[PDB]
Design a protein around this ligand. Structure first.
Ligand SMILES: CCn1ncc2c(NC3CCOCC3)c(-c3nc(CC(=O)N4CCCC4)c(Cc4ccccc4)o3)cnc21
Ligand SMILES: [As]
Ligand SMILES: [As]
Ligand SMILES: [As]
Ligand SMILES: [Mg+2]
Ligand SMILES: [Zn+2]
Length: 336
């Protein structure tokens, strides 16, 4: 059991202290990064897998796990403001919390739980800090590889799975062939669903499933076939990716600042290229505060409201936090 990645003895204690909140929505991943010598994804993933006895269940060597995770973390760009390993850490930890919501208790197999957390870990790996549309419009190598379709998301999967090809890093070595086959299918499905161009349709289908839901007597959702299970899993990882506004205001505000740095930097590159400036990426005109109000009203609230419906009453405190945070950014807009 590794307990630090740095030279600071005070950090072993501070890290173990922060990790007492592993199973909680209120964990502070920024502090985890500070106390792990900037290894939030390696350390959180290590903590999650031990908490769930996944290294034991799936006969994954601690040594191989750490080596794979360090290397995956190293393929996130630390010079990208938002889509770096802290984001991946956050989404994996958020997914670990959502998997334990009481409504889904006993629903998922171990393989499925494993797929979901691994999918969260890999889901933005090697992100270059610009959008699919910027890659397509600049005729980039990635858009030429992937034929303009879910360019980044296909890339994130490719990198994640390609890193398992070296024996020293193959954390899934002791799964069976069929297990590996099913996990791959599941992870591909979940990561491709994080493409925002698919959100409107994913929400429609999720609403449509909330409508016909069958909460069994003991309070647990009945999700009887693979199709229903993978559909909840894809929406869970999506919610987790879109969870920043549902966290304490102190955390949300730092997340907002990072995504706007990244977005504004894309705006600048576009200007440098004489391209049309994407309006939300334009630092000279766009309002951070309106963008968040807009993003919640149009995208985050409708999704979480629908998730809450599904897991009722598990998600009520998230919903209220969101509404508070929304109200907080509105009140920062100087006009009406
Ligand atoms: C800080 C809160 N937060 N977290 C994510 C996010 C966000 N976009 C993410 C982009 C990657 O995939 C998941 C969503 C945006 C955001 N994205 C867009 C456009 C979009 O969806 N893109 C761009 C590139 C990737 C997909 C906006 C602009 C916007 C649209 C509609 C209503 C209000 C604002 O804001 C704002 N706050 C975020
Ligand atoms: As750790
Ligand atoms: As390796
Ligand atoms: As933009
Ligand atoms: Mg992504
Ligand atoms: Zn993401």
């Amino acid at each position: 059991s590794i307990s630090r990645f740095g030279v600071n003895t005070e950090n072993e204690d501070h890290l173990a202290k922060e990790l007492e909140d592993l199973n909680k929505w209120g964990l502070n991943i920024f502090n985890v990064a500070g106390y792990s010598h900037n290894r939030p994804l390696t350390c959180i993933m290590y903590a999650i897998f031990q908490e769930r006895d996944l290294l034991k269940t799936f006969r994954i060597s601690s040594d191989t796990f750490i080596t794979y995770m360090m290397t995956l973390e190293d393929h996130y760009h630390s010079d990208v403001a938002y889509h770096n390993s802290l984001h991946a850490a956050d989404v994996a930890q958020s997914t670990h919390v959502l998997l334990s919501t009481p409504a889904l208790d006993a629903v998922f197999t171990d393989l499925e739980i494993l797929a979901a957390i691994f999918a969260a870990a890999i889901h933005d790996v090697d992100h270059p800090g610009v959008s699919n549309q910027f890659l397509i419009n600049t005729n980039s190598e990635l858009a030429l590889m992937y034929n303009d379709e879910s360019v980044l998301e296909n890339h994130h999967l490719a990198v994640g799975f390609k890193l398992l090809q070296e024996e020293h890093c193959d954390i899934f070595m002791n799964l069976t062939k069929k297990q590996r086959q099913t996990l791959r299918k599941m992870v591909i499905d979940m990561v491709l669903a994080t493409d925002m161009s698919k959100h409107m349709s994913l929400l429609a289908d999720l609403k449509t499933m909330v409508e016909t839901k069958k909460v069994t007597s003991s309070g647990v959702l009945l999700l009887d076939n693979y199709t229903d299970r993978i559909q909840v899993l894809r929406n869970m990882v999506h919610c987790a990716d879109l969870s920043n506004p549902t966290k304490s205001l102190e955390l949300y505000r730092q997340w907002t600042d990072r995504i706007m740095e990244e977005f504004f930097q894309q705006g600048d590159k576009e200007r440098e290229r004489g391209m049309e400036i994407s309006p939300m990426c334009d630092k000279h005109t766009a309002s951070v505060e309106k963008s968040q109000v807009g993003f919640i009203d149009y995208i985050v609230h409708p999704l979480w409201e629908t998730w809450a419906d599904l897991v009722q009453p598990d998600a009520q405190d998230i919903l209220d936090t969101l509404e508070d945070n929304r109200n907080w950014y509105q009140a920062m807009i100087p006009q009406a």
